[PDB]
Design a protein around this ligand. Structure first.
Ligand SMILES: COc1cc2c(Nc3cc(Cl)c(OC)c(Cl)c3)c(C#N)cnc2cc1OCCCN1CCN(C)CC1
Ligand SMILES: COc1cc2c(Nc3cc(Cl)c(OC)c(Cl)c3)c(C#N)cnc2cc1OCCCN1CCN(C)CC1
Lengths: 285, 285
């Protein structure tokens, strides 16, 4: 559909180094042999047919998700058993790594730009009926111009690949409705709210617990709130109050949240350009 | 694992006719060339690798589910592209077809034997961690001795084949718990209760509605009850009251239901032997 097999990628791309290692795999730094353009790349060795079929769905998601605030697909290739996925290199890297490099959380004006830009990307995702299912500061990348790029549509590809009655139990009926409209997309909205807390406090709620307890803690605990409400505005506190609704039916869409005072007046990305400048200067220290 | 490829099935089995047609496929009547034993069979033409992989899981479920009240696997074969699945022929056929042949529901003593035998089979299924996910009168078959055989582990095979975190939405957390112990097995208990109503009234609750409305009707309606409570015992009414608990956490297991007065005193299958005799005599009319 979008994977070019007729053209050899080594006749248009050159690997310049390794960006990241671990978990899902190695990420390489690549440059265009013609235009000189930079791309973050994955040269995945097709082990199983299932693993290959999963990455194709990811490429098809990446190819339709042509939006200012979503990572840009600069090409997908398949030659000599190796699958090449070229994505526009995001110089600032991930927001969680910036917080780690600067040893601090994001300021409220910085969170407001992230939030406003994510809400724009999620509204586009809902229009195309794509659920990200993996929002976190680690999947929000930075450009030098102060704009975010929503990354890693892997969990999205898997939950869409696996997707593609009188005696039914109500809990089964319910889980067939959380895997259907108008609930399935509301998950990313809760995740957005957790990502906002994570950017304000560096760590997500319930980080003090081992990951086994977390699932039961999200199920039984009341919606998470900001540790010091005096350190943040009433608008931020009210944004999380409505976005972190445990009931997905009452929880608003990304379109309804764009009307909230916490993001509606944001006309500049200056706060994030200032964040990227501070992180670059911190590297030289 | 259990599919014999080295031996040709046509050197041990002979097809004697067609039992059923439509939906999932054709079911053939077969006889043993050596012992003369009768088997209901499926000679499925392997179209896709996924369809073939799905039926293998079904055969592996059938092979471990060696129990008096579950259909018996008399062999699985694969030769010249055709997959043969041999199951012990259940002479009385399905309970829903018996109700249709006799133009009536099952009597309460007949329901009590079905219930007691299903609760025995489900208790064995829970011990082996297998969820049927498709209980209905159409999947309860009869022998001439008045015993049931729980059939069609197709939906079980699919929901097990497809089966084989701080930012997660609570509804996603919940659906990851309905696809996990101690909730995932409680679904078959609700289904059992619907099957009991279906055997008492010929039709399952909400049959008057088109199948699109049914999912929302199970979600929003109160637990179903028997149409005429004066026609049934207090024990039957109380059995459905506790088994058809919308909350899967409070809903009992098949082990706890075996202690209920509606099934605990059942020591004979006479009522079902009498049902099979009446259906055979009705055919001659
Ligand atoms: C961390 O490596 C980077 C990964 C990036 C990336 N990942 C990615 C993910 C996946 Cl799942 C893919 O496969 C579908 C593909 Cl093909 C690429 C995309 C995307 N998308 C875009 N741009 C990236 C840019 C990066 O480097 C910039 C960090 C510079 N830096 C180094 C340390 N320091 C001193 C300051 C900050
Ligand atoms: C309706 O055909 C029958 C299907 C049966 C059956 N299905 C089945 C399902 C599946 Cl999903 C399979 O594939 C995994 C396989 Cl291989 C077989 C199993 C099983 N299991 C066992 N025994 C059966 C017996 C039957 O015939 C008895 C009905 C006689 N009768 C005819 C009309 N009448 C005048 C009085 C009643």
């Amino acid at each position: 559909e979008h994977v070019r097999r007729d053209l050899d990628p080594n006749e248009v791309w050159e690997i310049v180094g390794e960006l990241g290692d671990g978990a899902f795999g190695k990420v390489y730094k690549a440059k265009n042999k013609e235009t000189g353009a930079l791309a973050a790349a994955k040269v995945i060795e097709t082990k199983s047919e299932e693993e290959l079929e999963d990455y194709i769905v990811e490429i098809e998601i990446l190819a339709t998700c042509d939006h200012p605030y979503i990572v840009k697909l600069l090409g997908a290739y398949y030659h000599d058993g190796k699958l090449w996925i070229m994505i526009e290199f995001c110089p600032g890297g991930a927001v969680d790594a910036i917080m780690l490099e600067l040893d601090r959380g994001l300021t409220e004006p910085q969170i407001q730009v992230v939030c406003r830009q994510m809400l724009e990307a999620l509204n586009f995702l809902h229009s195309k009926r794509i659920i990200h299912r993996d929002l976190k500061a680690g999947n929000v990348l930075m450009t030098l111009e102060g704009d975010i790029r929503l990354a890693d549509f892997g969990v999205s590809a898997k939950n869409l690949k696996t997707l593609q009655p009188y005696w039914m139990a109500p809990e089964v009926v319910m889980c067939e409705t959380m895997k259907d409209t108008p609930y399935d997309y509301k998950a990313d909205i809760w995740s957005l709210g957790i990502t906002l807390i994570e950017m304000a406090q560096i760590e997500p709620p319930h980080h003090e617990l081992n990951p086994m307890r977390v699932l039961l803690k999200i199920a039984k605990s009341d919606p998470p709130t900001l540790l010091t409400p005096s350190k943040w505005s009433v608008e931020f506190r009210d944004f999380l109050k409505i976005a972190l609704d445990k009931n997905p039916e009452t929880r608003p869409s990304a379109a309804q949240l764009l009307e909230h005072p916490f993001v509606s007046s944001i006309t500049s990305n200056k706060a994030l350009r200032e964040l990227v400048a501070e992180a670059k200067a911190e590297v030289m220290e």
